[PDB]
Amino acid sequence: MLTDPIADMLTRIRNATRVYKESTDVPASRFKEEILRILAREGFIKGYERVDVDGKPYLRVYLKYGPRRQGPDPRPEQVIHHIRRISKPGRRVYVGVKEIPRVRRGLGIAILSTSKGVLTDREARKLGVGGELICEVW
């Protein structure tokens, strides 16, 4: 019955990439989209589009991996190395603007809901706000 759909989505992705799949349809949702948007607007994906599997609306989300490789295990590197939910359904995590994390020393991002749209670390810190830390991606 999916306790937390978001943490699901993230995992849907996390599992996809692990074997380098084209796209993956996580059931649709305005908030998921909002999140997804920032994966594309920030470039962890080609992007996403609305779809349907019998009146039932998922989201086609096209991954994005690195260049093939020399040596053994020629499998490419990944754009999304590590994605994991922060605030959880059983331990909501909130932060003032000063507390906001600095993911992977500037190299990564920390998506996070707020009273004025789903920002990110830089995005909120600059916008001058805080809110529910949603997850960390890099």
Partner 1 sequence: PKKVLTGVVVSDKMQKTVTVLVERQFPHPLYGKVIKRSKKYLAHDPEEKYKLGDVVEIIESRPISKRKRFRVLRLVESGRMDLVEKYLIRRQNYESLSK
Partner 2 sequence: DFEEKMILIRRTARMQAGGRRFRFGALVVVGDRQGRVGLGFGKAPEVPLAVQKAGYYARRNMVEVPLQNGTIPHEIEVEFGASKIVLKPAAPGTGVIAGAVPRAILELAGVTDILTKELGSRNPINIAYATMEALRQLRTKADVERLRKG
> What are the residues binding partner 1 (CB under 8 A)?
90-94
- Decide: 105 and 73 in contact? Cβ < 8 Å: no
One DSSP character per residue, 91-107 reads B--EE-TTT---TTTTT
97 touches RNA by CB under 7 A: yes
**Amino acid letter for position 97:** V
41 touches RNA by CB under 7 A: no
42 touches RNA by CB under 7 A: no
Choose between 96 and 106: whose C-beta lies nearer to RNA.
Answer: 96
8 touches RNA by CB under 7 A: yes
Among 2, 70, 71, 105, binds RNA (CB under 7 A): 2
Choose between 1 and 107: whose C-beta lies nearer to partner 2.
Answer: 107
Choose between 62 and 132: whose C-beta lies nearer to partner 2.
Answer: 62
Burial letters 63-78, b for 16+ CB under 10 A, else e: beeeeeeeeeeeeeee
102 touches RNA by CB under 7 A: no
Sequence-distant (≥ 6) Cβ neighbours of residue 32 within 8 angstroms: 5, 6, 9, 26, 59
- Decide: 46 and 63 in contact? Cβ < 8 Å: yes
28 burial type by CB count under 10 A (0-12 exposed, 13-18 middle, 19+ buried): middle
Task: In angstroms, give the least distance from the CB of 117 to RNA.
Answer: 6
Positions in the binding site for RNA (CB under 7 A): 1-5, 7-8, 10-12, 14-16, 18-19, 21, 24, 27-32, 34, 55-57, 84-85, 88-92, 94-98, 113-118, 128-132
